[PDB]
Design goal:
Elements (H helix, E strand, L loop, with lengths): L7 H19 L5 E5 L6 E7 L3 E10 L3 H10 L4 H4 L3 E11 L2 E8 L10 E12 L5 E2 L5 E8 L12 E2 L1 E2 L2 E11 L5 E11 L1 E2 L6 H28 L4
Parallel strand pairs: 6-9
Antiparallel strand pairs: 1-2, 2-3, 3-12, 4-5, 5-6, 6-7, 6-8, 8-11, 10-13, 11-12
GO molecular function: lipid binding
Protein name: Carotenoid-binding protein
Organism: Bombyx mori (Silk moth)
Length: 236
């Protein structure tokens, strides 16, 4: 009767567990700087977490409203390949309610040859959060989109591609209002991204630290270009 493959209530439970894990981790103290970016304030940091291993966090400021980026990444996951060349393919498997979905993603190589091309089967939750990490309906402190790797029937590992494993991850956006150098008051986004992938190899931790920092700093270039194009179309 009861088989190896998860139910819909089990997918939602796992999505809620992963979102709470991602929010807990991304708000921990005591991060080590790995790499500062070219644009001012961009940083990749790391730390160790019991049960996950080494986790990486990008922080930077993006020049648009936090709500705008949240609604893009929430509602247009299949458009990722159009503006992010690192994402080769993105398909929604199923949408199951309460901001939970399943997706199939194919990534290009990253970290200058270290991180091979790979595919993923991702369980996501997308929510509005309070400052203490409760789900809210309106007046959010922050906006989250979590991810974790799961197994879905119909999406076995391909012989031609490594099946990657996202242990825990999220994007986490907070609205900021800033005074520019010219004195304009502008609505911007504090953009945070948590990454924690299993790689085979026993590839030295020093090599992985550089490769993961490179992946994160390459991705933010594509986000800023997306935002610049939206501003030039008067969307923001």
């Amino acid at each position: 009767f009861q088989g190896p493959h998860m139910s819909i209530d089990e997918y939602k439970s796992q999505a809620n567990e992963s979102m709470a894990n991602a929010w807990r981790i991304i708000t921990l103290p005591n991060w080590t700087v790995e790499k500062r970016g070219t644009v001012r304030g961009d940083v990749v940091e790391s730390r160790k977490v019991e049960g996950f291993g080494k986790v990486y966090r990008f922080t930077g400021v993006v020049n648009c409203p936090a709500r705008f980026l949240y609604e893009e990444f929430k509602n247009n996951l299949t458009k990722l390949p159009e503006w992010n060349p690192t994402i080769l393919k993105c398909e929604i498997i199923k949408e199951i309610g309460d901001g939970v979905d399943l997706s199939y993603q194919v990534t290009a190589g990253g970290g200058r040859g270290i991180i091979t091309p790979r595919d993923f089967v991702i369980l996501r939750r997308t929510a509005l959060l309070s400052r203490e990490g409760r789900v809210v309906d309106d007046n959010p402190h922050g906006y989250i989109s979590s991810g974790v790797s799961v197994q879905v029937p119909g999406y076995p590992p391909l012989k031609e591609m490594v099946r990657g494993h996202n242990k825990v991850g999220c994007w986490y956006l907070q609205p900021r209002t800033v005074q520019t150098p010219g004195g304009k008051i502008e609505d911007q986004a504090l953009f945070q991204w948590l990454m924690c992938c299993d790689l085979k190899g026993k590839i030295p931790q020093f090599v992985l630290d550089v490769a993961f920092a490179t992946v994160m700093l390459d991705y933010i270039v594509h986000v800023r270009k997306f935002v610049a194009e939206a501003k030039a179309r008067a969307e923001i």
